[PDB]
Amino acid sequence: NDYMVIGLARIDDRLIHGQVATRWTKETNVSRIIVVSDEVAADTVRKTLLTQVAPPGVTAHVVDVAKMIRVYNNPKYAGERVMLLFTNPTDVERLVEGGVKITSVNVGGMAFRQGKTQVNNAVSVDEKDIEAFKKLNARGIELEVRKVSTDPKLKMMDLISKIDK
Q1: 3-state helix/strand/coil string of 96-162
Q2: Domain architecture of the chain: domains with CATH
């Protein structure tokens, strides 16, 4: 707990897109952004582009779930405010199981796909994504769905309760 401070946890299969990362970085007062994804970490070309387009004064990093747990286990970032970028809530539950502390998770956006159910204008969930959200809620973790901080916040459970029931 007296280690890194999670300023915010945003889920988005697009990582950085539009001014979403720019606006959220200034509002979240974040000077560091870490991306957790094994598929992206295996793409050296995408990593170069994300690192070369990192907002001014903001550093973007790319690590895998196993390495992210070790970076957090280093008090070198104690107090430091870092934003976590995920592509699926499954990777969030894995960090929690490793003893990572998360008080709330924010759903930024999820590319829709066949076989999935649309819960929001750009948020899709599969039976696997829903299962991860229910476990986080069972742990007392808050789940909020919102595209921009200027948009009304909706509860992930409420959206899934009107679909799943």
Answers
A1: HHCCCCCCEEEEEECCCCCCCEECCCCCEECHHHHHHHHHHHHCCCEEEECCCCCCCCEEHHHHHHC
A2: 1-165 (3.40.35.10)
Q: Tell me the two tokens of residue 88.
A: 């699926």
Task: Please identify every residue annotated as catalytic.
Answer: 17
- Report how far residue 113's alpha carbon sits from residue 124's, in angstroms, rounded to the nearest whole number: 7
Query: Strand 32-36 relative to strand 104-109: parallel, antiparallel, unpaired?
Result: unpaired
Q: Is the Cα dihedral 84, 90, 91, 93 positive or negative? A: positive
Structure tokens at 144: 């909020």
What is the H or E stretch that residue 26 is in? helix 20-27
Q: How far is CA 41 from CA 11, 67, 104, 111, in A?
A: 16, 11, 25, 19
